[PDB]
Design a protein around this ligand. Structure first.
Ligand SMILES: Nc1nc(Nc2ccc(S(N)(=O)=O)cc2)nn1C(=O)c1c(F)cccc1F
Ligand SMILES: [Mg+2]
Length: 287
């Protein structure tokens, strides 16, 4: 699966300053010397880790197979010394979680972001891929409001001989009950995580956010599903309820949710999200 691994990355890319901790390794800003576009370079010390190597292999494989404006564009993977360079487009607006830091979102912003996440999920699920770590931190925005899915290190792939997955992966607050129970599951697991992400975008945090992650591992399969509480519109509450069904076959598909009243009534053009990005830039500058 490493068939298209490249060599000598610094002949095509310039590595610039560090921009953050990656799901694996550290991520640096960089320049594509061929276009002068800015890229993100995830650098992984293959020597330091080895248990994670399978997850690193999976991230590259999944990224290399995606071609969508709703999934972080993949440039390639490059070997240098003991380091692996995973190169992707740089998105200048930060994550949806970042954008929540200064204050609450309104329902137009929530709907716009959810609509784009849904387009990303529709793409992935049509490719028989399951993201398995949907949450605001893995939703990235361009500086002008485009919304893309990121961090495919625990993504799953269905095939003709593997029609379900059963791996225990994800982030506990966002995990579907059937994933926690390690039942056979599919793309409907992402739809549950989308429901939790909708609560996260509305309330600023997922249900059970104050609890130790191990505690929520028993609470989620046991308890009734979360609902969105507070003075939110009925269609937003219904959107969340639709996603957060304990029985996965009763959850809608991403395509179906793109037609939900909440999305149709409230989603607007993505360029309006620049206001959110500007709010974050102002907020960050005085922290
Ligand atoms: N492709 C990509 N672009 C960005 N951009 C970005 C811009 C600004 C900020 S911030 N609000 O100042 O901390 C953060 C990120 N990240 N990115 C990644 O793959 C990436 C990721 F998914 C998760 C964590 C770190 C990353 F680096
Ligand atoms: Mg991540």
């Amino acid at each position: 699966g490493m068939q298209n691994l490249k060599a000598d990355p610094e002949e095509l890319f310039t590595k610039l300053e560090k921009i953050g901790k990656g799901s694996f390794g550290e991520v640096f800003k960089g320049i594509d010397n061929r276009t002068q576009k800015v890229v993100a370079i995830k650098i992984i010390d293959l020597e330091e880790a080895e248990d994670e190597i399978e997850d690193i292999q999976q991230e590259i494989t999944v990224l290399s197979q995606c071609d969508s404006p709703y999934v972080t564009k993949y440039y390639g993977s490059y070997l240098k010394d003991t380091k692996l360079w995973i190169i992707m487009e740089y998105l200048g607006g930060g994550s949806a979680l970042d954008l929540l830091e200064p204050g609450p979102l309104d329902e137009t912003q929530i709907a716009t972001i959810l609509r784009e996440i849904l387009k990303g999920l529709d793409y992935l699920h049509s490719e028989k891929k399951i993201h398995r770590d949907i949450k605001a931190a893995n939703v990235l925005l361009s500086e002008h409001g485009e919304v893309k899915l990121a961090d495919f290190g625990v993504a799953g792939q269905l095939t003709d001989t593997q029609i379900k997955r059963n791996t225990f992966v994800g982030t506990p607050f966002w995990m579907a009950p059937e994933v926690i129970k390690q039942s056979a599951y599919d793309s409907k697991a992402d739809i549950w995580s989308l429901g939790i992400t909708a609560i996260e975008l509305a309330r600023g945090e997922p249900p059970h956010s104050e609890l130790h992650p191990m505690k929520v591992l028993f609470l989620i399969p046991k308890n009734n599903p979360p609902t969105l509480e507070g003075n939110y519109s009925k269609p937003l509450k219904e959107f969340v309820e639709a996603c957060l069904n304990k029985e996965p076959s009763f959850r809608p598909t991403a395509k179906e949710l793109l037609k939900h009243k909440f999305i149709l009534r409230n989603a607007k053009k993505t360029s309006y999200l620049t206001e959110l990005i500007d709010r974050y830039k102002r907020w960050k500058a005085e922290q």
